[PDB]
Enzyme design. Structure first.
Site, PDB file in Angstrom:
ATOM      1  N   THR A  51       0.814  -1.215   0.000  1.00  0.00           N
ATOM      2  CA  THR A  51       0.000   0.000   0.000  1.00  0.00           C
ATOM      3  C   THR A  51       0.850   1.269   0.000  1.00  0.00           C
ATOM      4  O   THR A  51       1.864   1.352   0.697  1.00  0.00           O
ATOM      5  CB  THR A  51      -0.932   0.078   1.232  1.00  0.00           C
ATOM      6  N   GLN A  83       2.193   3.070   3.169  1.00  0.00           N
ATOM      7  CA  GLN A  83       2.128   2.095   4.238  1.00  0.00           C
ATOM      8  C   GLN A  83       3.426   2.129   5.031  1.00  0.00           C
ATOM      9  O   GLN A  83       4.508   2.308   4.467  1.00  0.00           O
ATOM     10  CB  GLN A  83       1.851   0.689   3.706  1.00  0.00           C
ATOM     11  N   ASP A 140       1.514  18.550  11.292  1.00  0.00           N
ATOM     12  CA  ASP A 140       0.469  17.526  11.385  1.00  0.00           C
ATOM     13  C   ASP A 140       0.273  16.953  12.776  1.00  0.00           C
ATOM     14  O   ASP A 140       0.294  15.733  12.986  1.00  0.00           O
ATOM     15  CB  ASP A 140       0.657  16.419  10.333  1.00  0.00           C
TER      16      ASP A 140
END
Ligand code: NA
Lengths: 282, 294
Positions: B18, B21, B136
């Protein structure tokens, strides 16, 4: 209820995925969408009728690979040739012949007309979600399933994705606080996808996403960079990309646009795409 | 090296076979574990990335930061996307969000919130003093070690743990922890990331801990994005909280970032500064982490 795909379907690689029917070896395309622990099943069962149109990847079934620590698998017909986004990426100069763009755009519009007639909005039209078969047929991935999922508030509608294909009306601001939109938003996306085919990326691709989100409702409609293209192509882009959706042509109107309606080389175009797919595939 | 883009061969390797990932990995020479975020990159993406590496600041290890070990390129065949590996210290005890989720009632005691919030601010102060913005801050991007240490996620050019929802630098993301100034809106045409945007996110993360979810969790993300720059700053729903906590929230969530306090000022706020039960709290955190592994 919806099952776990184990022993029924397996994911091979990504293209949406190449998936395989375990018992028979038949291939399928699998759209993977995370989900929240029922009524998913219900919408699919209303919509699946619609996927039968030749320009939509036909529904095979649906499965959920549990779980917390959920994921919906939307199984559909395999399209061997990959996405139009991969095609352009694998094409020298990252640009398709204009008459290829006409063919592909028309097929997208035919698929959309089918959904729209039945009051379904696709909501995720882009090159990534438009697939090609070995014989160079064009099929939309999904048929309203992801559209329905983006409705529900909850832990699996917590992210805003890429903004580049979003129509102005989809982006809230003070004169548009409710981001009011309909089927015509899909047509703005089709226009952006046509540029994608022409230039290799949507407009504003080099811009920070947040800034792109700011610019879309405020900038004039995007245009093709190069003047090499025909007047009819420029005109088709202009129609897809009418700024105010209230005056944007519908799907049936765009199907009558000269760029789309008049394709005297269709047979040849399909032949060319077929060969190009072979030569260019990785 | 935090400034070259090498093949990871013989430096780092995946241990768990992914896009975006994160995998468990291992430093080849020392056997020390690592968290390795793996991303497909085109050739052009590789130039963009080289440029972002030049833009990276130099700062030392810090106990409240999961050490960024660097960026690498795993080569693929010609015609095929290479892989970017972003490598970070391994923290095995999950995120603050996992912590909340695993707490009965999905909520944390007030002294837990002060403790964790302080540790977050300490990491942030280290970044900010070095002219770095985290960008973030949220429960998901604050990690626990098995020793109950609180560490900010640091993947160098990336600041998130979970898999990127789309190709790097191409998606908006989740809007809930975003400060008003980072949201482009009618009155903010040039989205400002400033070091104080992290302090707003810190404030949101404290509400995330107090209530189990950030404010506006009942809105579709696009509606939240629209609301954040327009609404007055969010508040705790309950009145059960101490005056100090309310005052801390209000300090973090000053609407105008130009008028919002610095990290150093927030670290002196009574809610952060005065923690008479911190020794117990850490003990309590460690037991929680222990219980959980079972
Ligand atoms: Na079909």
């Amino acid at each position: 209820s919806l099952r776990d795909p184990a022993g029924i379907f397996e994911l091979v690689e990504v293209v949406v995925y190449k998936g395989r029917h375990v018992k028979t070896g038949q291939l399928a395309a699998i759209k993977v969408m995370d989900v929240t622990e029922e009524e998913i099943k219900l919408e699919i069962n209303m919509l699946k009728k619609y996927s039968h149109h030749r320009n939509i990847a036909t529904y095979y079934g649906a499965f959920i690979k549990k779980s917390p620590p959920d994921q919906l698998w939307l199984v559909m017909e395999f399209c061997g040739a990959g996405s139009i986004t991969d095609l352009v990426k694998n094409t020298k100069g990252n640009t398709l012949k204009e008459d290829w763009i006409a063919y592909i755009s028309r097929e997208i519009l035919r698929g959309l007309a089918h959904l729209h007639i039945h009051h379904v909005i696709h909501r995720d039209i882009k090159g990534q979600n438009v697939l090609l078969t070995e014989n160079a047929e064009v099929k939309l991935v999904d048929f309203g399933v992801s559209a329905q999922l983006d409705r529900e508030v909850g832990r699996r509608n917590t992210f805003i994705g890429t903004p580049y294909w979003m129509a102005p009306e989809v982006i809230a601001c003070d004169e548009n606080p409710d981001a009011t939109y309909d089927y015509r938003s899909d047509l703005w996306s089709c226009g952006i996808t046509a540029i994608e085919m022409a230039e290799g990326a949507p407009p504003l691709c080099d811009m920070h996403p947040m800034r792109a989100l700011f610019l879309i409702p405020r900038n004039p409609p995007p245009r093709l960079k190069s003047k090499k293209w025909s007047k009819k192509f420029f005109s088709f882009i202009e129609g897809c990309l009418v700024k105010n959706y209230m005056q944007r042509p519908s799907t049936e109107q765009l199907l009558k646009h000269p760029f789309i309606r008049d394709q005297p080389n269709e047979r040849q175009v399909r032949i060319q795409l077929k060969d190009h797919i072979d030569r260019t595939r990785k």
